[PDB]
């Protein structure tokens, strides 16, 4: 027998346990609100043909007036935002932002500090294990859409066991050719192209006829509670920016292609329910980082 | 919490002294000088109890006569009158006996698994959540194994004599090291020169300690991912094939004329400061690859280096596997120690400790590591123990990051070249006669050399004591001869030798006592398989039945010197061909024997039981 | 600076009640504590001036992650004005006051295994002055009362004759003893002598004079609170009161 | 000869025929505008440090002033939107919502019910059929990017026929190695890495030489008329939410991973023009559902 | 001989020793009173359209004004109540709530904070020991009502000893068939269906004739001093909620199906007089926990 | 092998699909509030002697 698993689900590194209190959660949300105002201040400056909208926006964000010949870095808020992102990724990353500085910055604006107001849908497909008999080969490729290629070299038809975990809500399976899939003890249905499954239903058995290889494409949807201001387009951009800037460059950590893979991998790990809470705050921190750094590139 | 490994000390990294958690914390055996001194004394005591230096000196004359009586060809004779050969025979004979006993226990375990394969398959398939150690207990209970404990305490209790690691300093005690001749080619002078070893061989022995792994250690890595009984048996044979090849290399380093390096630990000269760092350099004598482990703070880094192809300037060879940056030029106190685990076993714990580097305190990292290297004591943290066994299987399996066959082959070629270079250098300096005394060309590998294995018998059938010797497996191909020496108090006696195959056994009756008598001559092909009476075999069992016996010895000899090697078998090679060893258990009663019973008889002729009388 | 200005036991304990633990902990990397170094003192010598760094200097140092380092960081803050680098302690512990850590079991920190002799030696009690030793002894007594180790505290004082003479007299559970106490614990203050803008040779003396000169500037700064002229503008909660009692005392 | 087809194009189930009149389309447009205002009310609430902006938008949407204890659900408009969504998906779905309720809800906002003001570009690749000789193997995997892996074992070079339908406007093919492709009854050109094709040109012949496999990656662009307010990011999120909540759980229906696959599959049916008009209204309904449920999770 | 005992009486774990002073008991009483007003405020907010009753009730309970887009959690009082409940169940549970916080919350309302005003009746039956001869089988099932099944396979009639402890006040035994029961060393009466017994009277002997089995159904009433606000229905519901919310998972603690059998089991242990005092305070805390969590879920 | 199951879990009959909209659920809530007031009116009647 052989075991095949998705690459991104393997060994989720521990996440940080600091800056998760109510006071620090307000700071991340306040930073996101004020970092957004920097982006819109650019358009308002063009309409008014003046830098007054940007001066008001930057002064609130950085606590100093903008000056020429000085590289606009964002002041103390940018430094604090960069360091809390470092602490969220790894538990071994030092926490060097004082609480009194977090509280002072969080008082700059009034925001709703709740990070569970809304939800978002995540598209990473979890394939925990694929169990295959001796004479069959299984390969798994992809994270957003997983293509599972199975080839039967044995004499008789083989049964392949698919385990999609328990966190995902729905999983849609599509095959290159019609195939039969059923539950552990349910009878096999007629072959058809697509199947809709609930991961909590149980392990799924797929018959693999001898002959041409069969390819199954998997798509999953997962619901995670997030703050209402959460935006997947901005979080993904911030995730790439932080990786390039070296904010995640610390020993004994894993690396992921997208924030979608990172949050799903931590969800399926041990103590997953309390790990995703930290990852959500990291996403909102990365959303603020993307908007602030695009307005003030250094 | 998120971490599966939980440190005994909490996140505060403080454990109060005198509490249960502190009592069960691991100890730094290497770093503590009280602990290191105690371990060395107990090790020396164990060696001196089983192997007595005063006994080995007395048996030198008897062994020398037996080796000459083998009538070996010129250039292949073993002359125990020369001190260098006697010292090499002492180390080799004890080395081969320990390897032989481990192989014998492996065959019994394989037979036990195959007898209850249905129950074993159920345990392996149904139960996967339990750890490797728990799985071993259930398997060792389902099969009626003589030793049913995988704990270090139970292993030491049931280890028995003959498997105790050899202690080099005890062997080298009291031997003359410096003799000069000063241009005197005379019979008296040459006789005197033959009585003393040189300084190089003395230094080799003081840094030598063999490692022999019990089958109860091998079972935990074997069953960690095994799903069937065949996979479990195939994994057991693959590990022991690697161990035996490494054990052969260990003996070859003494034969070639150079000083082997010594493992050591470098620690800061100032004790009890803020800055804490440790460097471990492991030079396994029974292997081809080394390990360098560095722990600065809570950061662990390792580097696997080749022990071959190294210049005199640098002790370390090329790096074959990297796990970080390790600085071997650090300055501090150097403490020399002798590793009690193989390179793979040391490497397996290093990978597991790196994963849990931030989840354990520094004292836990050091204590768990040093206890394993210096005592072969597995960590008490069960989660850490399970990860180590998973890495041990991976390092042995076909998907290993290290190509063991390539490195073992390079080590063999490098050692052969060094012997030629050292022999030529001494030939020019002193002469051929002196060079042959100090670098014997007859010894070579451990399983290539002509060697004797004293046998111990605890089973008596109708007044006849059974001595069991397992023939094979062979790592070389050629022609092999086997001889038996029987010392008995009675002036006239009749003793019987039996060779068990897959289908039938061969019965031999002999009378000659003190001179060796040839029992079996075999031919083995490049696959390490011999044709014994029309059936391919990988190993055979030889049992000697002697009445009122005092000592029984078996001599193994290859027809040609430096027999060519057979490629080491792996997991795929073992599962391909299966041989049945269930017949190695049945015995015969020499007392109830007739003339018709002697000879080669197949099982069909005998009844159920009664493997003595051929009437069906 | 503010902690060094307190001159009475009542003011010192009152400051510790309102000061969280994060003020004791420093987030600067500093350097390793015990090292023989050469520093530059150009006002006195052309050659480099040897000295040994220590934990009771006014500059942050690297500290051990154990509980011993946390207590040793608290005492160094009290006697020197700066703490050490112990990161990732946690929000729950850092938000508590310094008095709560030293006196209360509800914090969740266990300190009954601490050895006063080893802590004193690591803090270089020999280099401390009279006020510094009195302040450290206050920390020891609060820890002893928390752990029920009053007998051990008394024996440690008996072994050290100079420490017994200067040991402050107060029961860590009674507020009446704190009010009566008249020991002078000030390290910085308004100087009666002539204080000049000149350097000192050692690291400890030079760093101490920086706080002394800084306190003079702080005294005349707008941040300083003048009780005589602005007592009505102070909030009632933090206004000075004759019947001021620490909670639970 | 062997025929291989895209999985998502197979058997498009009939869509509903209710709630397609001018009044019903206005209700969907009204809900989308009101739901959009509900999301932006959260950001305005933070700036004002009050719940007045949110209370205003919820009152317009749900026709009731919220109480603190009550769990906000959207009221009658939310119920009407949900049942309308189920009806569009399948012809078997009942039409619970009466027309009187739809007309009342459509008068809450002043917005047109038009659905043809703008256009959108959809990226599903319609590989209708691939015809291949006997001694060759062809597999089709993927919808947004179609990878066709072809390997022949016969002695001679094989000709493979690709049919991309008539709906798609542009199809771009890229291969692992340069390959030969030409239209039916047209001379074969030299081997090239990339080809730009118009699907109306006709079936395309690919020369498949004997040897290593050849993989062609396909991307397609299709123009479908949609309202100006259409936003593909919100529609796709609403599609996954609708599947998660079980709004599409009806007997004898097909299931798709994305709204792109759903609308393209229906467009390739016999009554494609009539089906697409219903599907566009579903997309705007799903866009409103995504905004309303994120602001008011239940 | 053979011995049988009730399952729930086996190995009662030690209880906590913190938060048992007068001030802490006042905090538990205050929380119960304020939590009851939260539930009652919902009905008052229905009679009058205003949300004033709930805002007043929540502001007193949580020390903050309720907000529409922020989750209602109960504030500092909810955290104190949850942590205090954990402490009572086990002596290994940490006591992390500062006393200054408990005293502050106890000043919100003026209540007695007294634990011995009234009483309550608990229905668990403490069958401590049933002693049977060699050739008889005895099985005890049930806690609220205990059915003891006895079968005699011997030659003659057997005597079975029943021990009900000394705590329970009255025990009523009803049998499937009439049976004989008397005290130790006393003449045996005529067979009758039901018996009323005082457990302090002594061990009770039952004649078990040879033949069909005899089943005895046991019910017991015990009086335990409780506050005047004690309500058994609310305590039992709160007990189940705490077990599901994870408040009782501590290493080496016994688990019970009801609060009724939890307090009776602790009462039959050594120093059971002192253990019941702590358990009663836990009951009022559970009563407050149930009302607060129903009003403010999660 | 033998299978035993709970009696009350066997064959749950389908429930109705009407009167589940927002308006119908409000009617059920209104009836519960009005019915509750009806019961408490009896106790108030005794106190008022009317």
mmCIF file of N, CA, C and O in Angstrom, chain B residues 558-603:
data_model
loop_
_atom_site.group_PDB
_atom_site.id
_atom_site.type_symbol
_atom_site.label_atom_id
_atom_site.label_comp_id
_atom_site.label_asym_id
_atom_site.label_seq_id
_atom_site.Cartn_x
_atom_site.Cartn_y
_atom_site.Cartn_z
ATOM 1 N N UNK B 558 38.470 -18.969 3.407
ATOM 2 C CA UNK B 558 38.261 -18.795 1.979
ATOM 3 C C UNK B 558 39.472 -19.318 1.219
ATOM 4 O O UNK B 558 40.612 -19.187 1.670
ATOM 5 N N UNK B 559 39.214 -19.912 0.054
ATOM 6 C CA UNK B 559 40.296 -20.520 -0.715
ATOM 7 C C UNK B 559 41.279 -19.461 -1.196
ATOM 8 O O UNK B 559 42.499 -19.634 -1.091
ATOM 9 N N UNK B 560 40.774 -18.347 -1.713
ATOM 10 C CA UNK B 560 41.615 -17.271 -2.195
ATOM 11 C C UNK B 560 41.649 -16.099 -1.233
ATOM 12 O O UNK B 560 40.682 -15.829 -0.524
ATOM 13 N N UNK B 561 42.781 -15.404 -1.213
ATOM 14 C CA UNK B 561 42.938 -14.237 -0.354
ATOM 15 C C UNK B 561 42.205 -13.052 -0.969
ATOM 16 O O UNK B 561 42.083 -12.935 -2.195
ATOM 17 N N UNK B 562 41.695 -12.176 -0.105
ATOM 18 C CA UNK B 562 40.938 -10.993 -0.512
ATOM 19 C C UNK B 562 39.790 -11.374 -1.448
ATOM 20 O O UNK B 562 39.755 -11.003 -2.622
ATOM 21 N N UNK B 563 38.852 -12.140 -0.902
ATOM 22 C CA UNK B 563 37.736 -12.621 -1.698
ATOM 23 C C UNK B 563 36.904 -11.443 -2.202
ATOM 24 O O UNK B 563 36.646 -10.497 -1.449
ATOM 25 N N UNK B 564 36.482 -11.462 -3.465
ATOM 26 C CA UNK B 564 35.692 -10.347 -3.998
ATOM 27 C C UNK B 564 34.358 -10.212 -3.281
ATOM 28 O O UNK B 564 33.779 -11.190 -2.805
ATOM 29 N N UNK B 565 33.869 -8.979 -3.216
ATOM 30 C CA UNK B 565 32.704 -8.644 -2.414
ATOM 31 C C UNK B 565 31.408 -8.887 -3.180
ATOM 32 O O UNK B 565 31.373 -8.917 -4.411
ATOM 33 N N UNK B 566 30.332 -9.059 -2.418
ATOM 34 C CA UNK B 566 28.980 -9.190 -2.945
ATOM 35 C C UNK B 566 28.218 -7.928 -2.570
ATOM 36 O O UNK B 566 28.294 -7.470 -1.423
ATOM 37 N N UNK B 567 27.505 -7.354 -3.537
ATOM 38 C CA UNK B 567 26.774 -6.117 -3.297
ATOM 39 C C UNK B 567 25.777 -6.290 -2.159
ATOM 40 O O UNK B 567 25.082 -7.306 -2.069
ATOM 41 N N UNK B 568 25.717 -5.290 -1.283
ATOM 42 C CA UNK B 568 24.863 -5.374 -0.106
ATOM 43 C C UNK B 568 23.395 -5.388 -0.513
ATOM 44 O O UNK B 568 22.952 -4.562 -1.313
ATOM 45 N N UNK B 569 22.647 -6.337 0.040
ATOM 46 C CA UNK B 569 21.234 -6.460 -0.280
ATOM 47 C C UNK B 569 20.431 -5.346 0.381
ATOM 48 O O UNK B 569 20.756 -4.878 1.474
ATOM 49 N N UNK B 570 19.371 -4.928 -0.297
ATOM 50 C CA UNK B 570 18.471 -3.893 0.188
ATOM 51 C C UNK B 570 17.075 -4.486 0.366
ATOM 52 O O UNK B 570 16.873 -5.698 0.254
ATOM 53 N N UNK B 571 16.106 -3.614 0.655
ATOM 54 C CA UNK B 571 14.746 -4.076 0.913
ATOM 55 C C UNK B 571 14.159 -4.789 -0.297
ATOM 56 O O UNK B 571 13.516 -5.835 -0.157
ATOM 57 N N UNK B 572 14.365 -4.237 -1.494
ATOM 58 C CA UNK B 572 13.817 -4.858 -2.695
ATOM 59 C C UNK B 572 14.448 -6.215 -2.968
ATOM 60 O O UNK B 572 13.771 -7.124 -3.458
ATOM 61 N N UNK B 573 15.738 -6.371 -2.661
ATOM 62 C CA UNK B 573 16.401 -7.649 -2.889
ATOM 63 C C UNK B 573 15.919 -8.720 -1.920
ATOM 64 O O UNK B 573 15.854 -9.899 -2.285
ATOM 65 N N UNK B 574 15.582 -8.338 -0.688
ATOM 66 C CA UNK B 574 15.173 -9.324 0.307
ATOM 67 C C UNK B 574 13.764 -9.843 0.051
ATOM 68 O O UNK B 574 13.506 -11.040 0.214
ATOM 69 N N UNK B 575 12.836 -8.965 -0.339
ATOM 70 C CA UNK B 575 11.473 -9.412 -0.598
ATOM 71 C C UNK B 575 11.373 -10.194 -1.900
ATOM 72 O O UNK B 575 10.403 -10.933 -2.097
ATOM 73 N N UNK B 576 12.346 -10.046 -2.798
ATOM 74 C CA UNK B 576 12.290 -10.769 -4.058
ATOM 75 C C UNK B 576 12.391 -12.273 -3.881
ATOM 76 O O UNK B 576 11.615 -13.033 -4.466
ATOM 77 N N UNK B 577 13.345 -12.722 -3.068
ATOM 78 C CA UNK B 577 13.600 -14.141 -2.849
ATOM 79 C C UNK B 577 13.418 -14.438 -1.368
ATOM 80 O O UNK B 577 14.013 -13.766 -0.518
ATOM 81 N N UNK B 578 12.605 -15.444 -1.062
ATOM 82 C CA UNK B 578 12.298 -15.820 0.310
ATOM 83 C C UNK B 578 12.800 -17.229 0.579
ATOM 84 O O UNK B 578 12.527 -18.150 -0.198
ATOM 85 N N UNK B 579 13.531 -17.393 1.678
ATOM 86 C CA UNK B 579 14.028 -18.686 2.115
ATOM 87 C C UNK B 579 13.417 -19.032 3.465
ATOM 88 O O UNK B 579 13.168 -18.153 4.295
ATOM 89 N N UNK B 580 13.174 -20.320 3.677
ATOM 90 C CA UNK B 580 12.516 -20.805 4.881
ATOM 91 C C UNK B 580 13.555 -21.326 5.865
ATOM 92 O O UNK B 580 14.360 -22.197 5.521
ATOM 93 N N UNK B 581 13.533 -20.792 7.086
ATOM 94 C CA UNK B 581 14.460 -21.196 8.135
ATOM 95 C C UNK B 581 13.771 -21.944 9.272
ATOM 96 O O UNK B 581 14.360 -22.103 10.344
ATOM 97 N N UNK B 582 12.537 -22.406 9.065
ATOM 98 C CA UNK B 582 11.831 -23.103 10.135
ATOM 99 C C UNK B 582 12.474 -24.437 10.478
ATOM 100 O O UNK B 582 12.200 -24.987 11.549
ATOM 101 N N UNK B 583 13.317 -24.967 9.597
ATOM 102 C CA UNK B 583 13.957 -26.254 9.818
ATOM 103 C C UNK B 583 15.219 -26.159 10.661
ATOM 104 O O UNK B 583 15.774 -27.198 11.030
ATOM 105 N N UNK B 584 15.683 -24.953 10.978
ATOM 106 C CA UNK B 584 16.898 -24.808 11.765
ATOM 107 C C UNK B 584 16.692 -25.154 13.231
ATOM 108 O O UNK B 584 17.670 -25.190 13.984
ATOM 109 N N UNK B 585 15.454 -25.403 13.653
ATOM 110 C CA UNK B 585 15.161 -25.674 15.053
ATOM 111 C C UNK B 585 15.225 -27.154 15.408
ATOM 112 O O UNK B 585 15.560 -27.490 16.550
ATOM 113 N N UNK B 586 14.913 -28.046 14.471
ATOM 114 C CA UNK B 586 14.837 -29.464 14.793
ATOM 115 C C UNK B 586 16.219 -30.039 15.082
ATOM 116 O O UNK B 586 17.225 -29.632 14.497
ATOM 117 N N UNK B 587 16.256 -31.000 16.001
ATOM 118 C CA UNK B 587 17.486 -31.605 16.486
ATOM 119 C C UNK B 587 17.449 -33.113 16.280
ATOM 120 O O UNK B 587 16.419 -33.695 15.931
ATOM 121 N N UNK B 588 18.600 -33.745 16.500
ATOM 122 C CA UNK B 588 18.723 -35.194 16.480
ATOM 123 C C UNK B 588 19.359 -35.650 17.787
ATOM 124 O O UNK B 588 20.004 -34.877 18.500
ATOM 125 N N UNK B 589 19.159 -36.928 18.098
ATOM 126 C CA UNK B 589 19.712 -37.549 19.297
ATOM 127 C C UNK B 589 20.801 -38.531 18.892
ATOM 128 O O UNK B 589 20.496 -39.636 18.419
ATOM 129 N N UNK B 590 22.078 -38.174 19.041
ATOM 130 C CA UNK B 590 23.150 -39.093 18.626
ATOM 131 C C UNK B 590 23.125 -40.431 19.339
ATOM 132 O O UNK B 590 23.615 -41.422 18.785
ATOM 133 N N UNK B 591 22.585 -40.493 20.557
ATOM 134 C CA UNK B 591 22.556 -41.756 21.287
ATOM 135 C C UNK B 591 21.715 -42.797 20.560
ATOM 136 O O UNK B 591 22.107 -43.965 20.463
ATOM 137 N N UNK B 592 20.555 -42.396 20.048
ATOM 138 C CA UNK B 592 19.673 -43.302 19.316
ATOM 139 C C UNK B 592 19.899 -43.138 17.815
ATOM 140 O O UNK B 592 19.049 -42.655 17.067
ATOM 141 N N UNK B 593 21.082 -43.560 17.379
ATOM 142 C CA UNK B 593 21.488 -43.441 15.988
ATOM 143 C C UNK B 593 22.040 -44.771 15.499
ATOM 144 O O UNK B 593 22.655 -45.525 16.258
ATOM 145 N N UNK B 594 21.812 -45.049 14.220
ATOM 146 C CA UNK B 594 22.292 -46.258 13.571
ATOM 147 C C UNK B 594 23.113 -45.885 12.344
ATOM 148 O O UNK B 594 23.175 -44.723 11.936
ATOM 149 N N UNK B 595 23.754 -46.897 11.755
ATOM 150 C CA UNK B 595 24.614 -46.656 10.601
ATOM 151 C C UNK B 595 23.821 -46.163 9.398
ATOM 152 O O UNK B 595 24.318 -45.337 8.625
ATOM 153 N N UNK B 596 22.594 -46.656 9.220
ATOM 154 C CA UNK B 596 21.768 -46.214 8.102
ATOM 155 C C UNK B 596 21.321 -44.766 8.244
ATOM 156 O O UNK B 596 20.992 -44.132 7.236
ATOM 157 N N UNK B 597 21.300 -44.230 9.466
ATOM 158 C CA UNK B 597 20.820 -42.867 9.671
ATOM 159 C C UNK B 597 21.825 -41.828 9.193
ATOM 160 O O UNK B 597 21.434 -40.707 8.851
ATOM 161 N N UNK B 598 23.110 -42.166 9.169
ATOM 162 C CA UNK B 598 24.120 -41.206 8.750
ATOM 163 C C UNK B 598 24.061 -40.982 7.245
ATOM 164 O O UNK B 598 23.816 -41.909 6.469
ATOM 165 N N UNK B 599 24.285 -39.741 6.836
ATOM 166 C CA UNK B 599 24.287 -39.355 5.441
ATOM 167 C C UNK B 599 23.293 -38.246 5.169
ATOM 168 O O UNK B 599 22.764 -37.604 6.081
ATOM 169 N N UNK B 600 23.040 -38.021 3.883
ATOM 170 C CA UNK B 600 22.090 -37.009 3.442
ATOM 171 C C UNK B 600 20.720 -37.649 3.256
ATOM 172 O O UNK B 600 20.550 -38.519 2.395
ATOM 173 N N UNK B 601 19.748 -37.218 4.056
ATOM 174 C CA UNK B 601 18.395 -37.750 3.995
ATOM 175 C C UNK B 601 17.393 -36.607 3.943
ATOM 176 O O UNK B 601 17.461 -35.680 4.756
ATOM 177 N N UNK B 602 16.419 -36.693 3.038
ATOM 178 C CA UNK B 602 15.374 -35.638 2.934
ATOM 179 C C UNK B 602 14.310 -35.843 4.015
ATOM 180 O O UNK B 602 14.277 -36.932 4.610
ATOM 181 N N UNK B 603 13.471 -34.835 4.254
ATOM 182 C CA UNK B 603 12.460 -34.921 5.342
ATOM 183 C C UNK B 603 11.457 -36.035 5.060
ATOM 184 O O UNK B 603 11.014 -36.668 6.031
#
